[PDB]
């Protein structure tokens, strides 16, 4: 979880599944509210 | 930067 913090846009590309899972379902599942 | 990301499946 400390590796995914230091991922830069010039070295990695965010996949569509981590777009559709870690931004809409689970922030509403754990009361995060952006 | 070129040959080893082909083998190791980095792909930018």
Swiss-Prot record, chain A:
Highest classification ranks of the organism: Eukaryota, Metazoa, Chordata, Craniata, Vertebrata
Gene field: CHRNB4
Family the entry assigns: Belongs to the ligand-gated ion channel (TC 1.A.9) family. Acetylcholine receptor (TC 1.A.9.1) subfamily. Beta-4/CHRNB4 sub-subfamily.
Superkingdom to which the source organism belongs: Eukaryota
Subunit structure: Neuronal AChR is composed of two different types of subunits: alpha and beta. CHRNB4/Beta-4 subunit can be combined to CHRNA2/alpha-2, CHRNA3/alpha-3 or CHRNA4/alpha-4, CHRNA5/alpha-5 and CHRNB3/beta-3 to give rise to functional receptors. Forms stoichiometries such as (CHRNA3)2:(CHRNB4)3 or (CHRNA3:CHRNB4)2:CHRNB3. Interacts with RIC3; which is required for proper folding and assembly. Interacts with LYPD6.
Positions spanned in the full protein: 316 to 349 of 498
Location(s), subcellular: Synaptic cell membrane; Cell membrane
Function: Component of neuronal acetylcholine receptors (nAChRs) that function as pentameric, ligand-gated cation channels with high calcium permeability among other activities. nAChRs are excitatory neurotrasnmitter receptors formed by a collection of nAChR subunits known to mediate synaptic transmission in the nervous system and the neuromuscular junction. Each nAchR subunit confers differential attributes to channel properties, including activation, deactivation and desensitization kinetics, pH sensitivity, cation permeability, and binding to allosteric modulators.
Protein name: Neuronal acetylcholine receptor subunit beta-4
Curated annotation (Swiss-Prot), chain B:
Post-translational modification: Ubiquitinated; by STUB1/CHIP and thereafter degraded by the 26S proteosome complex.
Cellular compartment(s): Synaptic cell membrane; Cell membrane; Endoplasmic reticulum; Golgi apparatus
Function: Component of neuronal acetylcholine receptors (nAChRs) that function as pentameric, ligand-gated cation channels with high calcium permeability among other activities. nAChRs are excitatory neurotrasnmitter receptors formed by a collection of nAChR subunits known to mediate synaptic transmission in the nervous system and the neuromuscular junction. Each nAchR subunit confers differential attributes to channel properties, including activation, deactivation and desensitization kinetics, pH sensitivity, cation permeability, and binding to allosteric modulators.
Entry similarity comment: Belongs to the ligand-gated ion channel (TC 1.A.9) family. Acetylcholine receptor (TC 1.A.9.1) subfamily. Alpha-3/CHRNA3 sub-subfamily.
Biological classification of the source: Eukaryota, Metazoa, Chordata, Craniata, Vertebrata
Gene coding for it: CHRNA3
Disease with which this protein is associated in UniProt: Bladder dysfunction, autonomic, with impaired pupillary reflex and secondary CAKUT: An autosomal recessive disease characterized by impaired innervation and autonomic dysfunction of the urinary bladder, hydronephrosis, vesicoureteral reflux, small kidneys, recurrent urinary tract infections, and progressive renal insufficiency. Additional autonomic features are impaired pupillary reflex and orthostatic hypotension. The disease manifests in utero or early childhood.
Organism: Homo sapiens
Residues of the full protein shown: 347 to 358 of 505
Quaternary structure and interacting proteins, as annotated: Neuronal AChR is composed of two different types of subunits: alpha and beta. CHRNA3/Alpha-3 subunit can be combined to CHRNA5/alpha-5, CHRNB2/beta-2 CHRNB3/beta-3 or CHRNB4/beta-4 to give rise to functional receptors. Forms stoichiometries such as (CHRNA3)2:(CHRNB4)3 or (CHRNA3:CHRNB4)2:CHRNB3. Part of a complex composed of STUB1/CHIP, VCP/p97, CHRNA3, and UBXN2A that modulates the ubiquitination and endoplasmic reticulum-associated degradation (ERAD) of CHRNA3.
UniProt-recorded name of the protein: Neuronal acetylcholine receptor subunit alpha-3
